[PDB]
């Protein structure tokens, strides 16, 4: 027949640069989850995301998750550059016992949890201009305290606000205080947002509470790499194409192994 219908069950390590997220989801590696600290300055043609990947840091959700995942995956890099943000009047490097970095409390390595300094929490109004020649991706978030008492204790203001703005657009997020079900012993949550800062544009972070500040930017590039969900193991074989079921020979005019494919292999037919 002219239809390929069987995969070897493995993903060839060549020629595409496969990066295996053993226990890490792309976003987990992006934020710097404690068990995902091995992904730094990474590169890939195809990020393989295992169905068994799990998060182990602070519980969080990503509004507009698909867009961020697609953007980062298409970038083909996780090059993170630290920036010297000047957070005056707030305590930095906040953490939680739900995110065990070492033996004690910890947090995402790429996010900066700002907390009240002493008995006050000023209106942060920092700004980092993008004088470089590449798009900068800033990952920040807004913390959602479980109670009004927790909100005031962490952040002196009774109701916080995060306004990240640039020339193109702005996002204003108001935290939703309330008790959620425990996840690793926490009834609070974190929402992760992202902002692309084009060259010559300026990032403006204005906040009076609940800001999970960024520590820097991810150097974005206009790549064509991709991300794929697959439990197939990676073997030292060679195949010009990859499918979630694994590599498939790409010589036949057609294939029906999967509709999702990466690389140069035939058109899908039901």
């Amino acid at each position, epitope marked *: 027949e002219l239809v390929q219908s069987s995969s070897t069950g493995k993903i060839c390590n060549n020629p595409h640069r496969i990066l295996d997220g053993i226990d890490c989801t792309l976003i987990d590696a992006l934020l710097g989850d404690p068990h995902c600290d091995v992904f730094q300055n990474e590169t890939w043609d195809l990020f393989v995301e295992r169905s068994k990947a799990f998060s182990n840091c602070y519980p969080y959700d990503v509004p507009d998750y698909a867009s961020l995942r697609s953007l980062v995956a298409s970038s083909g890099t996780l090059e993170f550059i630290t920036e010297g943000f000047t957070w005056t009047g707030v305590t930095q490097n906040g953490g939680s016992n739900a995110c065990k970095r070492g033996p004690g409390s910890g947090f995402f390595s790429r996010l900066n949890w700002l*907390t009240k300094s002493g*008995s006050t929490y000023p209106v942060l109004n920092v700004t980092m201009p993008n004088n470089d020649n590449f798009d900068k991706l800033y990952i920040w978030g807004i913390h959602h305290p479980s109670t009004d008492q927790e909100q005031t204790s962490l952040y002196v203001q009774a109701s916080g606000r995060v306004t990240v703005s640039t020339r193109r657009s702005q996002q204003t997020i108001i935290p939703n205080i309330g008790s959620r079900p425990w996840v690793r012993g926490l009834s609070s949550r974190i929402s992760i947002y992202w902002t692309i800062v084009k060259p010559g544009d300026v990032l403006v972070i204005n906040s009076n509470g609940n800001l999970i500040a960024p520590r820097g930017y991810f150097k974005m590039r206009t790549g064509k790499s991709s991300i794929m969900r697959s439990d197939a193991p990676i073997d030292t074989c060679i195949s010009e194409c990859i499918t979630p079921n694994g590599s498939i020979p790409n010589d036949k005019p057609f294939q029906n192994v999967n509709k999702i494919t990466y690389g140069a292999c035939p058109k899908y037919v039901k």
Partner: antibody
Amino acid sequence: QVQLQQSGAELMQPGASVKLSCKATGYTFAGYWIEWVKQRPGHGLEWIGEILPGIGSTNYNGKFKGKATFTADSSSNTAYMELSSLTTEDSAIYYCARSGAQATFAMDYWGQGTSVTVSG
Amino acid sequence: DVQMTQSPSYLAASPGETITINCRASKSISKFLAWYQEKPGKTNKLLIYSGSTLQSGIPSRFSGSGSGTDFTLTISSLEPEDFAMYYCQQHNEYPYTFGAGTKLELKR
């Protein structure tokens, strides 16, 4: 009706480690900071750090960054402080105090004080 | 770190008199200074916070004043129960620093 109940006195040999406890009652434990203060004769009070039991957020005095470690058992409404590598200098009275926004983060409710003596 | 200097370390008074405890901060702490009352056999008591706001349940005779680097706790018409140790603790910067404390003893 808020009171911070603290464990009894301790006697430790130098280089040992002790785990002070502070049980809170009468308020939602997870919402307020728990402060830890060190008092020894001739030096007055001295702030060690604080832990927000709900989140586990801790923040230590630089003078005690490695010596002390705060943990909170949310099921028991208890806050713990582990003193490590005790020396004769650590012989003091350790207070746990409640701290919240209603009092502008001045620690308004205090424990009885746990006396730890480090002596060989 | 903000060094807090509290004077006079020893203060003598008699009931009905008015006294003042001066606390000075090495750097400005705006208004965030609190006064505690320690006496044997009971937990430390928060008298004043944020410079002047006296805690609920504290008698009105306790008064706080000052801002920046100079603060004062004024006790008017001392009761026999007011003789104790008093500490000033700034809560503006982060490493909370207490004063040396002033012992308030009955005169004779």
